[PDB]
Amino acid sequence: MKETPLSNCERRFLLRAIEEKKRLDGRQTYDYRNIRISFGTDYGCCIVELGKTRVLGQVSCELVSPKLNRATEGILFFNLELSQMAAPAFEPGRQSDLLVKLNRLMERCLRNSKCIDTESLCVVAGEKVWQIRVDLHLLNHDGNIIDAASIAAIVALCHFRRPDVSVQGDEVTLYTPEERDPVPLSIHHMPICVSFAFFQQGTYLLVDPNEREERVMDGLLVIAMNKHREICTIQSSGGIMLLKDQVLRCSKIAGVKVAEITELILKALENDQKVRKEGGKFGFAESIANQRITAFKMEKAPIDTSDVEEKAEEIIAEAEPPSEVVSTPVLWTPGTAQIGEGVENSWGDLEDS
């Protein structure tokens, strides 16, 4: 199956809007759709919602032997993924020219910026070191997959907490959250992606576009830039043909937006740590809105486990015992034996000769 086609009335209406500098959902040009984060119970797991998009991030680490060369660092996998349920079009092996540009954007940003400290993830050299592995999934496609994926990866990496080890002399030991407290990571900076869309041959631009606005646009400009004033990647793409003042304007815009987004992320992580430290209840369950028609909650229930013995006993007692015709095995010659109705002759011989 494919996705519904685009009519010729919506295109005209969207372009009349864009000309008039008014958007569908009311938000003006330099705005984001507001954000809403939610944390799991075990560390390094979050659900970010930008507008109506969803991404699931989950970090996980493991101890391996560090290849050959680079004997004093650790490796860092990544794996974006697009879930068949995100949108009709996504198909497990039929959208192979978006996955590549997305994985590349994500990896170049996160791994070339050098914000994670992969220096201090060794135990010995030439021997076991930690191998982290980020994982993202797209749940609901409504445009701007990469801003949400980047914020998700950031939060998931800034909420993880490793295991921890004791090393002295030439001897290892591995603890557990009851034997020793999990340990945080070291994060230099916060690289946060921003996207721009261009409309009718660069004459207008719109920040943070959604999926209809994504189908009425010429090309896209992405500018990934960590906090302070330091750019980390740019990738023009789509169908665009650019000037030189516009890249600078865009860089300013991305500066502002990454400032605001980092503000938000820091505040949310702080609130989450405060909640976890007070001693209250946390998790995916205690996030479900209760003021809403589509939610229902039920505490525990002993059902009545008073009768199962009797029923099982009568059932076992009330049925026919195994019968008693026992079969015999036949021996032809050591190596082959037969059981069943058998064959008339011992074996065939000169049947046709």
């Binding site: 059932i315 076992i316 049925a319 015992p321 082959t336 034996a337 037969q338 069943g340 058998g342």
Partner: protein, 265 residues
């Protein structure tokens, strides 16, 4: 036509195979024919022929528990046994037929991985048991299990001794030991018709028209290892208790078969 024709034999109480709706096909096995493998066995079940082969190699023990030797089963369905299988990567039917055997090998505890290590933390045995179906007529998971269990009763390994200064492995190919086998899990399969009829030892056409399937495997002490019910019409406790009464006789039959063929050497 399809449904009504078969029920004519069902009401007649004699299905077109010539069976009383509660009896199994003819079963025969051979052991010790392929001389390029550690152990092998051929199982014939009135068609549905399956052959298995075992190869033993050396491997490094795992990082968590360095006292265990791996055992890896695999079931392959070539496009020559039937006409619906196509060439390429393994299909859904072979993957399920392999996960089922892996679960049986794990849950049944037929072998203990601590009996395969040579020197803890350095070297452990690894067993490669590969099953290839030569003809697909029906009841695949019964003959695959019987082929594996029959093969595992013939594999014999040579005595390996590791030096101290040399620290290498010297294989004594003259004195060859045996394998320690604990239990004997034997499976039995039932095919359920539209809502109430259950038959034993089905056929590919019957599985093509049936609406469900159930498999139960038993030990030598009346203990269930797995209860494979992929889904379908629905059953009750009385029907399951009827099935296990037949499975007890089937298990006694098969265990007498294995206890007799091995005795003949």
């Amino acid at each position: 036509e399809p449904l009504e024709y078969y029920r004519r034999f069902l009401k007649e109480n004699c299905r077109p195979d010539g069976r009383e709706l509660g009896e199994f096909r003819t079963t025969t096995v051979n052991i010790g024919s392929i001389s390029t493998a550690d152990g092998s066995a051929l199982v014939k079940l009135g068609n549905t022929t399956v052959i298995c082969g075992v190869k033993a190699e050396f491997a490094a023990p795992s990082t968590d528990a360095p006292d265990k030797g791996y055992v890896v089963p695999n079931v392959d369905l070539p496009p020559l046994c039937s006409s619906r299988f196509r060439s390429g990567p393994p299909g859904e039917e072979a993957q399920v037929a392999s996960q089922f055997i892996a679960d049986v090998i794990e849950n049944s505890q037929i072998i203990q991985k601590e009996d395969l290590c040579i020197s803890p933390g350095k070297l452990v045995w690894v067993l490669y048991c590969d099953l290839i179906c030569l003809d697909y007529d029906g009841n695949i998971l019964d003959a695959c299990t019987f082929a594996l269990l029959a093969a595992l009763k013939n594999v014999q390994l040579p005595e390996v001794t590791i030096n101290e200064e040399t620290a290498l492995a010297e294989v004594n190919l003259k004195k060859k030991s045996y394998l320690n086998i604990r239990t004997h899990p034997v499976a039995t399969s039932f095919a359920v018709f539209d809502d109430t009829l259950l038959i034993v030892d089905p056929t590919g056409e019957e599985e093509h028209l049936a609406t469900g399937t159930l498999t139960i495997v038993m030990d030598e002490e009346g203990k269930l290892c797995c209860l494979h019910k992929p889904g379908g019409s629905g059953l009750t406790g009385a029907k399951l208790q009827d099935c296990m009464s037949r499975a007890v006789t089937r298990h006694k039959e098969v265990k007498k078969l294995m206890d007799e063929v091995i005795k003949s050497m």
